[PDB]
Amino acid sequence: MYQLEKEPIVGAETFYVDGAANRETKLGKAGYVTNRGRQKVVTLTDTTNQKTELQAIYLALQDSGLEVNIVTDSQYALGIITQWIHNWKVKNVDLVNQIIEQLIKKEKVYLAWVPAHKGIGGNEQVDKLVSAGIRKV
Ligand SMILES: COc1ccc(Cc2nc(O)c(O)c(C(=O)O)n2)cc1Br
Ligand SMILES: [Mn+2]
């Protein structure tokens, strides 16, 4: 893949990703839930809210097939990744480029943003998973 899809890929698994992190401890969780009934969460150290969001996208790329829809609620994650694909058309640098490294090997990728905490089913589910034991209120 050298460019992102303009619309969702029909028949491709859709991963709803999210992350949460504790400001003081830097412990966080990154995870996904998909429309094929799969979920994964990993616990991370020395991380941030922004970094957990990128780590979640990494997990979705790692676990998905060659065509994949990924739905994030992170302005930062979408912005920073998009700032890459258009660029070749400083912070979390390694992780961003590792995501790009995964992206180019896919056949098709649709990456979309949705607003957090607005009752989007998949998004609410993954938010509940990653914030458990991480986000107080
Ligand atoms: C509409 O109400 C809200 C919308 C957003 C937020 C903050 C938030 N909460 C998350 O769980 C999350 O993943 C992200 C993010 O990635 O920016 N941002 C809190 C409320 Br109340
Ligand atoms: Mn989020």
Ligand SMILES: [Mn+2]
């Ligand atoms: Mn969330």
